[PDB]
């Protein structure tokens, strides 16, 4: 790897600089380099890794959706034939997106997940696995689409099982996992009732535990609870 000659600490320092400069591709490359050193990640380092790739793939997803919409419009009745260019460019963006997802999944599989023994770390990594299979599923149209969807489901479910046993209902990682798995149900698995039920139960169980929290923890938990509420409002 091009980052093999750089110190782990320098890669982390530069990831933080890249974040400040909104250079998320660089941030992701630095964090990949840091993961490939082979040492486990701290909480802060997990956050850096996730922020970097979320921002890179988020931009790719937004671009893919623009192109896919243009392509769909081209295939309607009355639309003039404009040749293969829209499909080609949508495929180009799609292939790059898939590459990023495969890169993240590769880091998780070699070897972040297997070395993660604490509940927070294991849940966080399994959530990420679900997320990146979900992004693959968004663009899947072939023989493997069912298996990609099931890979996302399985990762989210394992994370959910750990989270419920090991973390309080207000824990931000538990909350974020539930938020994202609920979106998986609604958008990917064609299970809107499951999505709504999960968001509602997660919200309600968190509400009942807020009394245990400091002011700072309350702020963290309630921010994600509001995201659950926002989705419920969109869906009901």
């Amino acid at each position: 790897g091009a980052m093999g000659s750089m110190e782990r600490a320098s890669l982390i320092q530069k990831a933080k600089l890249a974040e400040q400069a909104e250079r998320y591709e660089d941030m992701a490359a630095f964090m990949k380099g840091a993961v490939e050193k082979g040492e486990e990640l701290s909480c802060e380092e997990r956050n850096l890794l996730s922020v970097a790739y979320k921002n890179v793939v988020g931009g790719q997803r937004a671009a893919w959706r623009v192109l896919s919409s243009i392509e769909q419009k081209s295939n309607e009745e009355g639309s003039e034939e404009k040749g293969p260019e829209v499909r080609e460019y949508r495929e180009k963006v799609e292939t790059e997106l898939q590459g990023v997802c495969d890169t993240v999944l590769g880091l998780l599989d070699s070897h972040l997940i297997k070395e993660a023994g604490d509940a927070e770390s294991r849940v966080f990594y399994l959530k990420m696995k679900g997320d990146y299979y979900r992004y693959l599923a968004e663009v899947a149209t072939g023989d493997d689409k069912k298996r990609i969807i099931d890979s996302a489901r399985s990762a989210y479910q394992e994370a959910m099982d750990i989270s419920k046993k090991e973390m309080p209902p207000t824990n931000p990682i538990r909350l974020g996992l539930a938020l994202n798995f609920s979106v998986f149900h609604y958008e990917i698995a064609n299970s809107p009732e499951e999505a709504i039920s999960l968001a509602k139960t997660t919200f309600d169980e968190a509400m009942a535990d807020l009394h245990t929290l400091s002011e700072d923890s309350y702020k963290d938990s309630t921010l994600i609870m509001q995201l659950l509420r926002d989705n419920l409002t969109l869906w009901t």
Binding site: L179, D230, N231
Partner: peptide
């Protein structure tokens, strides 16, 4: 799109 984190 719905919120994710």
């Amino acid at each position: 799109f719905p919120a994710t984190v």
